[PDB]
């Protein structure tokens, strides 16, 4: 029932812009905050960016902090990752994900559901 | 803090409760 | 950040375990870890939160415990469904960032 | 040594408006939370409105809200409540009284000090 | 919407009893009632808090007891100057406001 | 006492708005946070709405959001539900619901006064 | 998302039960399931709130329990009057809104 | 509102003992009594706090006690040193305001 | 260590402000709160006013309230107490006290240490 | 092209409230202020409210202050005015209108395009 | 607040004038006045706005004048389209408010 | 048609407060603002207060300011003077004025509609 | 600030006048005199704006012009019912506070 | 900068126009 | 010198949301108003959209108001035209255009640089 | 909502004319019409702005002029060049929205 | 009728702080901005600091700024320079003035009205 | 910033003229000087505001001119009333504060 689909991705030149979005549907998306998670081809997943449910708090990793923004569009189920000055390092596939609700007492972060993928290759 | 929980959960008590202390004390401790 | 051994195998209906080692910061300040597993394509999945906590959906085949600074998700049975790479991932303190792990391809 | 002194009543014709005020002393009133209780001539008292030590907070009987305004002056000891809109119904004896301090399982508010009493006449 | 008799009486030197019945929202749910005591003109005083703790200036002869989803207020003694009205006080969780009492008139 | 009564259905044309109103009386109404819910005919209830005792927090199931919009006009016992481009599929009996007051280890929100049923027929 | 039988029935003065499970987000959360009573027009009425605590006006023989992840109402006597569609009601934590049970009928 | 005896008196070595009296809101709510020595000019300095408890440089001939609703300071040695007024302060829920007593004056 | 050393006394005419200043040093000022004690002359001591620790809360005396303002310079170890419409019955010696750090089950704020004394006379 | 469209009339008891709206279509919405006209039964038209165009300034007449509320929702080409308190006086046809952008020395606003006409009947 | 005749007539083919009389804050400051025609039904249309100006849709017979401290409409032809109210329109700085005038019935 | 009538007044002990109120009907009162003036009895007309058409900004005269205070409750037509340490010099006549609209080269305000005239007398 | 003669007077039908002489930051800082009317009770009324600038309703008897740092209001004919009190009125932008005239009698 | 005129002139017009301009101007300059 | 580079066009079935964008190069963007046209296939060009140089000024056609959305990214010479809930009727090529500085009596904007043209086809 | 011919037609060498009529609000308002050309695919590029001012890089074979609440695109010489479809551009006060043509195209 | 009338001089030992205030009357000193000059002993004048009418903005000089500051308490007429880290080098008479209301070209602020003058000796 | 002369003296009943010369920002930004009279003690006053317009109250023998980046302030007659220091003021631009003159004495 829950759905995470994405669209948006491509090949950008070096230097470009480029916008990606997730729509979901099937759960109450103004009350998540969700996850951008990037998966370069053969290495490993690392993080990118955290969106409160209202979007007030936006965190960024080191290697993308000033380039990328991450907002949310409340009253249609979209998240965006606005990715500005693309580089040859930002080419991998790029997953929407959300954060479960659960509670413990060292609380970190998990992203139960996760979007298709969509793969943005920065080349020539 | 990235590690603070950002949902809301819509089920928190909506209402509001008239009989609350509505008074203060002002011998709490005031230091910290 | 946090550190796993490069691939794993088993033969089928034997146990394997995959060890997950991180610092002060991401394991010491006792942060739970979160296991996904990431088949080929296949946007990976939730396996394991909070330190073994099971989803429900996953079988029981897969289980995880904590202890002092490294994690480990133990899988018993192994079968060829349970190909995939198995990934960490926590809050770093100090980054102020989640970590992931380098994650492990299960071969069988 | 706690005194409630009130003031303001009087004849008032339908639709019009009226304030009634209550000055007390001898306490630390922006430490207390006060009510206002209502007697039809002849009835039992009734409930009008309860605001907080701070004035954040007010609650209004059903039967008053829309019209009544309840309202406190902290500066200068004093407690009001604005009346529009003043049908026949409201004409009463009105009362200001004095949340007690107390702490109790079952807590629930108790009016300790109460006012003179001021009648409000709505009449032609 | 809390239930008192109309008028209650005595001979002075003997024992009556004043009872407040309220629902399973008003005093089955735990709120404490409280009496005031009304002379004509007279704006009512505090009698009994809590059921049943006395304030002081109260003579003793004022005593409250609680039982079920009703109070009473049990007063000895029944002078003249004891005669007044008397209203209970408690807080409704399903109205979300403060409830009195009908009133009872003890007339000695 | 607690009373809930409600106006504005009737049939509307696909494509167009309608809003429904909630008029309460008897309770505390601006202490209490109220949701909608929507019956389609000869089917099980399901949740619309949700809003807060201020009108602050307010959550909205996936099939109305974007479209519908809950609030409530406090200082005169009023809830409304604002619905715009209505579709075929919300056609139903909404119902305007109150949150009782408990409390419990496992507490998820109850529905103790409901509202009359008004029905909302978007055809042709 | 909470699953109900399509309908129950019983001869007049026997007792039944409506049965309703649901999933770990739902009941296997710790989520109160309560319960409404549906009669033709007649917008509903709570009947059970809490995992079986009655308010007042429901008469005793509605009754309520919690067993593992599903929930029931055992309704006793069985009366003409108690010929209505129950439904059943609760929070789910994963879907983060409150899920209506399918509704069932019972016809004596 | 705190009542104190105008003055007392003793020769030196023997002992005195200087009384509170407060309401059931002052010393009757459980509010602890606070007493302040004070000589001429030379602004008063705390003797001993929370019903006896000596501060640090406070004779071990100063000591306290509380009884229902008033307490009492006792003096040991009643020296020359010990020329000077004896204040309390305790909180007072009724006013919701800090209460100092009339205070006494010791004159050996 | 411990010191609190006041000034700004003098002889005020009625109706005049006149502000009263206390300098403390030897302990972390911002970490404590502070009281206002006024001695008439002859007469017993009385509470003026406290103000919490970073300054958020303040409570008067009945007699002193929306005359007298109590407020502390958090960055400079100091504290003032502002006196407005000085009245004749407003004479008296102006203490400075700190309330003590102490833990018991009937806890009432104790000044442990007390600032020099400032006459204020209000005469012609 | 011009088109004002309006709905929301019927008969209302006194002292229940209704809203009436009016749809526009053709022209640039949230550039163009609009006014209420009300004409009761056999007389002239009367004055009810204005707004300008982006809603932040409206102004009543003196016979319905304190009771209409006029505004737009300025996304979806719609004009409002809700009305509260419905008085027997208040029993005419609603007319929707739009301000004509014109200048001159003299400048008074002009309607030019007029709502097709509500009726609203305030008895029993 | 506006003044008009009642009504005016007459005989097809023939010139009529209606008259709007106001006063020092209605068309004395200056304030445009502006004519509206309304048929039975039919919510009324802008007949001529700003003292004269006659906007497009509006055949030539209608024309109108301001003199002092009021204007008028004068309308030619009258034929049988021309039967409605007429209401002028202006702003009073006194009032500070729009201005409606009486309105008049031209029956031809 | 533009009136204004004023209430409140009567014989106030010095020391005590007083608040005087101006109900207005027949045209925008919340698109003007009005003055209070006051004349001591057997003398000439003084100003008092002055308060903008939406209240934000107000000014008073020398001998009235830190006790009086003006303001108006715009949605009732109603503006108000609170008048607290009412001194013996505070006796007098007081009338609720209207700004003029006109346009000078040398705007100086002018009061063109003013209310009844009441008294306030401060004696014993 | 603004100052009148105490008092007027002149036999019916004789034209009287009445002086307000203002400072640099009354009248020769450009500010407007308004004037007022005031009869017994009968709270005062404008008479004059702006200089002379006559309101509707006032006769033409009253006039009013400026000269230099002074006004002066004109009134001719001088009937019964002018017998009342003329009241300034103007802005001084060193005081920045309006200011009324000293007030006048004209008594016929 | 300090040389920004400090008072207040409580002479300005307190009054408000119903009368002004209701309208927006699409058509007007958007650029700087 | 001057330059509009387009992006973002494509197929988008009935229902969807895209974006479309405008780069710009060789004039100081910050400084200029903008427009979006559009071209259905074989018909006449039409507006769609204005945006101010600061972007506070928005105004849209009738038939794309409350579902397209224009913005501008000031920082880095980039114009942007969301388009939501695109219907069938929405299918033509979207041209990015400049408003050109020039003084007339009858200013009306005019367009002198425009972009490459981008297609936008509604179907299935 | 302006108004032009479907198409245009002239020999090479020759003159030729496009109208562009519209209403009282468009261009009997006061408003500059535009003309934009746009040959097949190739976004229109400003022709003449302002009622016939050329812009740099126009060749002096286009020009225009306003007549009343029309205005026309003289086109000289007629090339190969000018195969393309001519579109008006002005503001409508009555819609407040801006307005482009119906569009020629010329054929030559 | 203006006076400014001034107090709080002294000698007051280096590092120490002190207060000065500026008592004004006859006028509508809410109104007016006002300035601190300062003169040293057989030295020019010298400017301090400048408030605005309501206090959002103080502007101070160079030797000075970061230790005087300068504020009004708007409601009894009273303007303040609180004086903290007293060097040798501000030990002058200081002078309360306020700027005069008057319009030119090139206005530059005039202090009609100055204070008595009080000094202010630091000094051992 | 701003440059005076020392000193100025003058036979009574003759002419002085004290100057004051500044910056560009002081003067050649346009930024009128006011001139203020300082007697012993007795706090200065403003004597000359905005280049020369005299205030009510002061002589007419004070007058001032501005000319380039210097400004006077003539004084005639020159009697004994007239000792005293007069100082400039104005605006810095660059260094956003107001600054005086060094101040004369005038000595007769």
């Known amino acids: 029932q829950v759905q995470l689909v994405q669209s948006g991705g491509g090949v950008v030149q070096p230097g470009r812009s480029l916008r990606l979005s997730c729509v979901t549907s099937g759960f109450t998306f103004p009350a998540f905050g969700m996850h951008w998670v990037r ?73 139960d559901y996760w979007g298709q993928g969509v793969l943005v290759t920065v080349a020539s | 803090n990235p590690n603070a929980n950002p949902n809301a959960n819509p089920n928190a008590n909506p209402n509001a409760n008239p009989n609350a202390n509505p008074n203060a004390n002002p011998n709490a401790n005031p230091n910290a | 950040v946090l550190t796993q051994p490069p691939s794993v195998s088993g033969a089928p209906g034997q146990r394997v375990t995959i060890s997950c080692t991180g610092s002060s910061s991401n394991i010491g300040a006792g942060y739970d870890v979160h296991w996904y597993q990431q088949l080929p394509g296949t946007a990976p999945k939730l396996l394991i939160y909070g330190n073994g906590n099971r989803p429900s959906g996953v079988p029981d085949r897969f289980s995880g415990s904590k202890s002092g600074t490294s994690v480990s998700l ?24 989640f970590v992931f792990g380098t994650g492990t391809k299960v071969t069988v």
């Not at chain 1, 991998?92 to 609700?101: D, L, S």
Request: glycine share 6%; proline share 1%; with cysteine.
């Open chain 1, 39 to 111: 998966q370069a081809p053969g290495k490993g997943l690392e993080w990118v960016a955290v969106i409160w449910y209202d979007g007030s708090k936006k965190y960024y990793a080191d290697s993308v902090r000033g380039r990328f923004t991450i907002s949310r569009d409340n009253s249609r189920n979209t998240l965006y990752l606005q990715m500005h000055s693309l580089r040859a390092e930002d080419t991998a596939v790029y997953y929407c994900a959300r954060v479960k609700n659960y509670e413990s007492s060292g609380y970190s972060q998990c992203l």
């Open chain 3, 74 to 97: 133990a899988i018993t049975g192994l079968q060829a469904e349970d190909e995939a790479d198995y990934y960490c991932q926590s809050y770093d303190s100090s980054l102020s960032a």
